[PDB]
Amino acid sequence: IQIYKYVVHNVAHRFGKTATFMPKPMFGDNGSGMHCHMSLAKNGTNLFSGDKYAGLSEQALYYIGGVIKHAKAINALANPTTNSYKRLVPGYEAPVMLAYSARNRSASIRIPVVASPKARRIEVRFPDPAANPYLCFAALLMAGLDGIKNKIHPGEPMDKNLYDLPPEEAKEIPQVAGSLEEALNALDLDREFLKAGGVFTDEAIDAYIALRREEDDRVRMTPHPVEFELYYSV
Amino acid sequence: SAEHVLTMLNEHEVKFVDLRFTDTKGKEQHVTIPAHQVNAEFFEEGKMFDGSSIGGWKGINESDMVLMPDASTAVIDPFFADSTLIIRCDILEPGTLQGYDRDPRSIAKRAEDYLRATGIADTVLFGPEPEFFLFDDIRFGASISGSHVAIDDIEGAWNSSTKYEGGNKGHRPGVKGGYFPVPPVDSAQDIRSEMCLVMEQMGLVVEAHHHEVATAGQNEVATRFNTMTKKADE
Ligand SMILES: [Mn+2]
Ligand SMILES: [Mn+2]
């Protein structure tokens, strides 16, 4: 990703343009997002496969579990700078639900169709072109297996897009932690599953947070063009 | 009566008699008569002009029933005094009645008075509530090569970003939100207030005025009900 980026930025610039991995440059359009597909394998066997729901397997499910469990803490890692979340605004289109489906998007975890079990996977889309693939991936994984690890179980897939007497517990329904401060928080608490293995010191975590923190501030202290729109003549 | 009008003529000095008089298959029209020329004959046999707006094959002159010599008043607006004194269509001619291809004011009455000959009742009241738009610049055109139109008036959201010099001053009503909000924000009253004064001056009865709901100068002035023929002409 580190290259993928350098190259874009550069040819793009060499061509005559500026290239930007920001998640939501403009409003009412599409702000790039970095979907991440994944699966672990043992020998030349992806223990993500099997029977039981869309191909897949027990194993996978704990994964689907893991993410869903610390979704918030993760998106603190794989969803920074504020902008991140202007995309992670409740859509229906927008993947903010914490479920899995093979359709019924809105659903932040898509188990794409498959064919050859040879390649059965998990697409967790919410992550945005803005994270150190490093932390992000790590944290994705790190969780994924703490689920894989101590049981932890998805339950059922969506297949029933968002839209349900908004409340009607559709309200109840687990969300993609929309909103930095919030996300920041999660991570402050979730520590654990990260911290586990050594892959992640308290610091690391701390420092990290601590950083995103500042930006989050600069952003809210600075008054916004729109606020005038609506709030000015009062 | 004329005897009357007659005074009024001296009551005020006046010269000329005109503004608003005939009125098309579409709307409003006038011709100006030197103050003299008025005199019974005039009141009794009219004046006549011809065709243009609805009319076919030559010369169909039409009597101008200098009339509803009630519907007569000093127009503020024109320069030098003058009795705007409608006319009951062109009456016809020698028959003397429905102006060629119309006589909108006529039709009015046929209707009206016809009503009367049914017994369904005796008098029909109409109280229309006409709203209008008040803007600053209105440019448009169309032609082989292109077409277009532009509207502007300090107000109408759009204008905020707009630079002025005395400069912005930013209080204005944003899209469906011109809702009687008090002044700074209200392009202004004085225009309405004012319109009332004259409206009454002209002889209508005002019931209340205010801003309707539109970003850029939607204004409404209300007026007490009448009789079709009267109100219509009001
Ligand atoms: Mn994808
Ligand atoms: Mn109205």
Swiss-Prot record, chain A:
Compartment(s): Cytoplasm
UniProt-annotated binding residues for Mn(2+) 1: H35, E123
Keywords assigned by UniProt, alphabetized: ATP-binding, Cytoplasm, Ligase, Magnesium, Manganese, Metal-binding, Nucleotide-binding, Phosphoprotein
Name used for this protein in its record: Glutamine synthetase
GO process terms (BP): glutamine biosynthetic process; nitrogen utilization; protein homooligomerization
GO molecular function: ATP binding; glutamine synthetase activity; manganese ion binding
Family to which the UniProt record says this protein belongs: Belongs to the glutamine synthetase family.
Residue stretches making up the GS catalytic domain: 1-234
Principal subcellular localization: cytoplasm
GO cellular component labels: cytoplasm; membrane
Subunit structure, as described in the record: Oligomer of 12 subunits arranged in the form of two hexameric ring.
